[PDB]
RNA sequence: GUUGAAACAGGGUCAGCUUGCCGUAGGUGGCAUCGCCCUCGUC
């Protein structure tokens, strides 16, 4: 995804090792270090509300990286909709129930698995 | 006899410790059993 100026910016910020060091020397960095599992994200300036992961190329990339990579998986068949719709192992971490986002529907122990 | 099987609520933890129902208060004050009535009549 080149010529974005949002990800070329961060890819030039993630090939820096010093500006990232400058992130620790920020006014409020001491308050993000307090929260375990802080989630930083990359809003390039000159978009002003829009993250690097909000530009209409990363937006399309994700809409392309959730339409190509998450479509070659196990071909069928949906429990929910019944369509072919490639099957999703690893249901996504439903947040707000547990102490951590937990996979609402998740059969992961040696025998909760039914038929192998 | 090819098709959800197997599966714990467990193990256990004094509700204890303790705390006057009390101090205290007239049943009083007061009120006629009265007014009255042949044991008679008589052998």
For residues A13, A17, A20, A21, the Cα torsion angle rounded to the nearest 10 degrees is -160
Cα A53 to Cα A60: distance, rounded to the nearest angstrom = 10
Cβ–Cβ < 8 Å for A88, A97: no
Structure tokens at A63: 């809409």
Residues 39-98 of chain A within 7 A of strand B, judged by CB, are none
Cβ–Cβ < 8 Å for A28, A35: no
Cα A72 to Cα A96: distance, rounded to the nearest angstrom = 30
Which bases along strand B come within 7 Å of a protein CB atom? Answer: 4-7
Cα A79 to Cα A3: distance, rounded to the nearest angstrom = 41
Interatomic CA–C1' length for residue A65 and nucleotide B40, angstroms: 145
By CB atoms closer than 10 A (0-12, 13-18, 19+), residue A7 is buried
Question: What resolution in angstroms does the PDB record give?
Answer: 3.0
Cα A7 to Cα A50: distance, rounded to the nearest angstrom = 12
Q: Is A94 helix (H, G, I), strand (E, B) or coil?
A: strand
Q: How many CA atoms lie within 13 A of A21 on its CB side?
A: 4
Interatomic CA–C1' length for residue A108 and nucleotide B8, angstroms: 21
């Amino acid at each position: 995804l080149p010529d974005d100026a949002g990800v070329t910016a961060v890819a030039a910020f993630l090939s820096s090792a010093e500006e990232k060091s400058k992130v620790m020397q920020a006014a409020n960095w001491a308050e993000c270090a307090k929260v375990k599992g802080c989630n930083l994200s990359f809003r390039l300036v000159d978009e002003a509300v829009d993250l690097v992961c909000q530009s209409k190329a990363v937006r399309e990339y994700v809409s392309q990286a959730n339409q190509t990579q998450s479509d070659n998986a196990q071909k069928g068949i949906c429990l929910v909709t019944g369509k072919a719709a490639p099957i999703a192992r690893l249901h996504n971490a439903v947040k707000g129930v547990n102490a951590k986002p937990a996979p609402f529907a998740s059969v992961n122990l040696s025998a909760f698995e039914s038929y192998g």
